[PDB]
Symmetry: C3
Subunit: 45 residues, 3 copies
C-alpha cells in the first residue's frame, strides 16, 4: 500500500508542476493584455 501511495504522490506532484507552468503562462499573457488596454486608453484619451 505504501508503495502505491508513493507512486500516487509522484503523480500528484507531476500534475502540480503542469499547473504551475500553466499559471506562469497565464500570468504573462494577462500582463500583456493589461499593457494593451493601457496603450489603447492612452490613445483614445
Amino acid at each position: 500500500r505504501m508503495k502505491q501511495i508513493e507512486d500516487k504522490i509522484e503523480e500528484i506532484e507531476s500534475k502540480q508542476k503542469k499547473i504551475e507552468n500553466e499559471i506562469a503562462r497565464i500570468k504573462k499573457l494577462l500582463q500583456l493584455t493589461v499593457w494593451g488596454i493601457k496603450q489603447l486608453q492612452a490613445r483614445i484619451l
Copy 2:
C-alpha cells in the same frame, strides 16, 4: 495511518480537479479578452 494518508490523497486530488477546472475557465475568458483588445485596436487604427 496509511488509511488517513489514503483519504488525504483523495482530498488533494479533489482539490487539484477543482483547480484544473478553474484554470480552464480562466483560459477561455483570457482568450476572449485578447480577441476583444484586437477588435478595439483594429477599429481605432
Copy 3:
C-alpha cells in the same frame, strides 16, 4: 516511510494553497481587464 509520506503530503498541500492564492489574484485582475475593455468599447461606439 509513512512519515516521509506524511511530510511530503504537507508540502503538496502547502503548494496547493500557494496555487489557490495565485488563482484568486489572477481572477480579480482578469475581472478588472474585462471591465476595462467594456468602458473602452462603450466610449468608442
